[PDB]
Amino acid sequence: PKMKTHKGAKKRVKITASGKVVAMKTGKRHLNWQKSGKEIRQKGRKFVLAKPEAERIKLLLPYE
Amino acid sequence: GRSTTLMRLPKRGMQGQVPGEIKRPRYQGVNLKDLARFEGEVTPELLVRAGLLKKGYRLKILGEGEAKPLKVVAHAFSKSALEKLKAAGGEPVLLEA
Amino acid sequence: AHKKGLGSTRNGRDSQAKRLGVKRYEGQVVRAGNILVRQRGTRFKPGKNVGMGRDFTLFALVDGVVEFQDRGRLGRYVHVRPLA
Amino acid sequence: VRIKLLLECTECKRRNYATEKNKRNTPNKLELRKYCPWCRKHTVHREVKI
RNA sequence: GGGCAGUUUGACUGGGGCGGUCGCCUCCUAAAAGGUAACGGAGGCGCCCAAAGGUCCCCUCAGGCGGGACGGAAAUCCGCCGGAGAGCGCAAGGGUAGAAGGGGGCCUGACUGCGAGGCCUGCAAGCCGAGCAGGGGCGAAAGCCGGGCCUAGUGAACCGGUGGU
RNA sequence: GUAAGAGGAGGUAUAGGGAGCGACGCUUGCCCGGUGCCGGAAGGUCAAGGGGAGGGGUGCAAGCCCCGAACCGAAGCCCCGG
RNA sequence: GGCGUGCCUAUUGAAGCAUGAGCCGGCGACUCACGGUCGUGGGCGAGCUUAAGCCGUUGAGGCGGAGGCGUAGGGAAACCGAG
RNA sequence: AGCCAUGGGGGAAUCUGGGCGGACCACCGCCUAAGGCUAAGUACUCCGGGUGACCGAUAGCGCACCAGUACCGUGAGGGAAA
RNA sequence: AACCUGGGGAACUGAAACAUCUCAGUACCCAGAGGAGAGGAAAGAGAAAUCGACUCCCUGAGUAGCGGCGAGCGAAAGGGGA
């Protein structure tokens, strides 16, 4: 019966209120030292598109 | 092979402890242009018989609307929805006395 | 069949080429911060609101259009002039 | 390499940060460079930790 | 503690095994955009500089012949000639003396909050940056400054260490 | 055999189990460095345990709960020789 | 007499000296349940609809708003709120 | 890492006794443990009766019929035709 | 015949590998009870001075959490009803 919303996805995604899947910027942890502040604040929020089809199609049930 | 783009990092802050979730008051907002539609009085138990709110614990007036004098009835009230209420209207807080 | 001592090599290494050339020419508008010349050394010196960055690379600086120049005792110039 | 290693700089006057590197091999004792913290203008900055 | 149990024990590849190989940057093959394959040719990177960084004052080489105690093909100085054959960490390629090279003074923009609009590209990541604004260094000013002449010196996520909010 | 117990064996180191060779005649040389194995009441490392100097949350406090050093806690491997 | 390299599977590509089948009959393979999702046929319309159950029927429907969807989003969160 | 349940060890109290409200402490509530019994609402179909946008002798129960029969295997079991 | 409670309790398979997790506390083994089984009056629930045995359905809810944060597994409270 009922599908199953994705745990991981949910707990790491930000699908916007317009059928747009837009998550967070990836590549920040064991980094930082010899790197531009540019890189710091530009590893803030992100975007993404296309496979966000599959993301939405996976969000599901409470949608979210 | 590659993490199915799972390479995307998490940001769901306070996504979960173990004793379930924190029992907090969830509010409920309402566009006061929807308010402009009807006229008379708007209590919690009334507006859920209508079509909004639905057992939303507390009510916060908000949104756009018109300068109509009436008895709004709720808990908290948006500061910018309190400027349409200066034009006309009554403001009741926290209910019981 | 018989196959005695053969061998191998060492050259199986080729650096990935990066897209390198010029992007916007004269006749083409560019509106503030649009790269137009990817170069190694100064194959194309900047100029009239042309701009170079931290790697020899010309980009838009005005909302105008490019054009060229040849100053032998100075180099090769690019000039992005807009309108009055 | 850890010889040049990796350390960070905090302000005096309570905490603050900024990201840097070192070089212990080179005549590098300690450092009191001069940068900017999150709060207010430019100030001290003291060397500490890994 | 194989005595017994359940499982791991890469892939490429002129059949497989041995040998070699996996990623990053340069130069050909590459046929004047891009790009373009091979166990096809040729070499390099996992580091370095708190000054090898940032501004202002300034100088220009490698070499050639001629002339000189040690020196003497080549330590040094001098004369005249000498448009880049020198240098620019490291491989090569691009480039550069109208500076990126080499000397000195003050310093510390390997700055914060942001980022128009472009490179590139399946995704992801990577590359570029005017200006705004805080305040800051130097500069008589004009002004430069989001490290190094540029391309290699790099590792999404999950785990947690440590300081803070 | 989880076990009760079983065979061993109502047999006793000329007896019972395990291994290498395989009558008999000749014979069986050097190496304890790696390892297996025999022993060795000093010792390194290490367990739960035992212990409690010392720290914290909280109550006004009495108290309660957690963190925990010194130092004593085996087998074992290291060590020592055969 | 003019002409004329079997059917299938698989192949870059086959009549195949590649495979499957002597011949005829009958059986024999993209469904369903729930959720999801693009549309599409209607009804309603800032509203829409009920599940379990209860009542009725002997293929007779009907009550039954509990709930789910919708009117608002932004942010990890507090909270702010057409921002 | 609470709470419930407990295999080894220690080892209480009787209404200021006592478990829990998710480390733990204060408080404020909640409930009275370590004795037992309880229908109905729910499940199941060997069984009987009713129904069908269920099959019509290869389909249908394996079996429309003299089927858990023939016969196959020691054997557990297999499983016809009609 | 099947359902029901308790005591034992796998593997394939999934995670495109495989242990941790899955399948599942399922298949089967055993014990026993009965038209039912079992369950059963609160040392409960849960945050409101709020309720009031137990089983059942729906909703809550793929929610809240659990997790080599992967596979995926997945509560009770409240509500409406029996």
PDB file of C-alpha atoms in Angstrom, chain C residues 12-73:
ATOM      1  CA  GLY C  12      48.815   6.708 -20.226  1.00  0.00           C
ATOM      2  CA  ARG C  13      48.497  10.238 -18.828  1.00  0.00           C
ATOM      3  CA  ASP C  14      46.929  13.188 -20.639  1.00  0.00           C
ATOM      4  CA  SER C  15      45.797  16.318 -18.827  1.00  0.00           C
ATOM      5  CA  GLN C  16      42.150  17.272 -19.349  1.00  0.00           C
ATOM      6  CA  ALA C  17      41.942  20.114 -21.843  1.00  0.00           C
ATOM      7  CA  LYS C  18      39.987  23.119 -20.592  1.00  0.00           C
ATOM      8  CA  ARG C  19      37.855  25.163 -22.983  1.00  0.00           C
ATOM      9  CA  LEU C  20      40.268  27.871 -24.081  1.00  0.00           C
ATOM     10  CA  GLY C  21      39.621  30.635 -26.602  1.00  0.00           C
ATOM     11  CA  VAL C  22      37.782  33.940 -26.944  1.00  0.00           C
ATOM     12  CA  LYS C  23      34.043  34.161 -26.275  1.00  0.00           C
ATOM     13  CA  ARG C  24      32.626  37.545 -27.326  1.00  0.00           C
ATOM     14  CA  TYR C  25      33.972  39.441 -30.341  1.00  0.00           C
ATOM     15  CA  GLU C  26      33.155  42.894 -31.712  1.00  0.00           C
ATOM     16  CA  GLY C  27      29.547  43.403 -32.778  1.00  0.00           C
ATOM     17  CA  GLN C  28      28.580  41.488 -29.645  1.00  0.00           C
ATOM     18  CA  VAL C  29      27.156  43.234 -26.609  1.00  0.00           C
ATOM     19  CA  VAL C  30      28.297  42.154 -23.174  1.00  0.00           C
ATOM     20  CA  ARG C  31      26.658  43.432 -19.979  1.00  0.00           C
ATOM     21  CA  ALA C  32      28.982  43.726 -16.981  1.00  0.00           C
ATOM     22  CA  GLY C  33      30.853  40.616 -15.858  1.00  0.00           C
ATOM     23  CA  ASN C  34      30.713  38.401 -18.935  1.00  0.00           C
ATOM     24  CA  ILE C  35      33.978  36.604 -19.688  1.00  0.00           C
ATOM     25  CA  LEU C  36      35.062  36.855 -23.331  1.00  0.00           C
ATOM     26  CA  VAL C  37      38.731  35.833 -23.623  1.00  0.00           C
ATOM     27  CA  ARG C  38      40.246  32.711 -22.041  1.00  0.00           C
ATOM     28  CA  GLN C  39      44.029  32.858 -22.408  1.00  0.00           C
ATOM     29  CA  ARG C  40      47.256  31.540 -20.853  1.00  0.00           C
ATOM     30  CA  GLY C  41      49.690  34.403 -21.249  1.00  0.00           C
ATOM     31  CA  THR C  42      48.533  37.818 -22.417  1.00  0.00           C
ATOM     32  CA  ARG C  43      47.426  36.783 -25.913  1.00  0.00           C
ATOM     33  CA  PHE C  44      44.942  39.641 -25.629  1.00  0.00           C
ATOM     34  CA  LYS C  45      45.705  42.691 -23.470  1.00  0.00           C
ATOM     35  CA  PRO C  46      42.546  44.395 -22.079  1.00  0.00           C
ATOM     36  CA  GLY C  47      41.606  48.043 -22.480  1.00  0.00           C
ATOM     37  CA  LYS C  48      38.570  50.323 -22.760  1.00  0.00           C
ATOM     38  CA  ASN C  49      36.503  48.847 -19.926  1.00  0.00           C
ATOM     39  CA  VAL C  50      37.839  45.406 -20.695  1.00  0.00           C
ATOM     40  CA  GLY C  51      38.980  43.554 -17.594  1.00  0.00           C
ATOM     41  CA  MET C  52      41.480  40.846 -16.760  1.00  0.00           C
ATOM     42  CA  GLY C  53      41.437  38.589 -13.702  1.00  0.00           C
ATOM     43  CA  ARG C  54      43.740  36.318 -11.703  1.00  0.00           C
ATOM     44  CA  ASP C  55      44.637  34.057 -14.660  1.00  0.00           C
ATOM     45  CA  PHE C  56      44.812  36.135 -17.853  1.00  0.00           C
ATOM     46  CA  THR C  57      41.138  36.291 -18.846  1.00  0.00           C
ATOM     47  CA  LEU C  58      39.170  39.131 -20.430  1.00  0.00           C
ATOM     48  CA  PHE C  59      35.589  39.813 -19.327  1.00  0.00           C
ATOM     49  CA  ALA C  60      32.840  42.411 -19.785  1.00  0.00           C
ATOM     50  CA  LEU C  61      33.014  45.588 -17.704  1.00  0.00           C
ATOM     51  CA  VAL C  62      30.537  47.797 -19.566  1.00  0.00           C
ATOM     52  CA  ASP C  63      27.151  46.996 -21.081  1.00  0.00           C
ATOM     53  CA  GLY C  64      28.676  47.633 -24.498  1.00  0.00           C
ATOM     54  CA  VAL C  65      30.441  45.917 -27.370  1.00  0.00           C
ATOM     55  CA  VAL C  66      33.964  44.639 -28.121  1.00  0.00           C
ATOM     56  CA  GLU C  67      36.500  45.545 -30.858  1.00  0.00           C
ATOM     57  CA  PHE C  68      40.181  44.896 -31.589  1.00  0.00           C
ATOM     58  CA  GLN C  69      43.632  46.472 -31.889  1.00  0.00           C
ATOM     59  CA  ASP C  70      47.206  45.683 -32.939  1.00  0.00           C
ATOM     60  CA  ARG C  71      49.969  47.624 -31.197  1.00  0.00           C
ATOM     61  CA  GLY C  72      53.133  45.734 -32.126  1.00  0.00           C
ATOM     62  CA  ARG C  73      55.459  47.587 -29.772  1.00  0.00           C
TER      63      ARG C  73
END
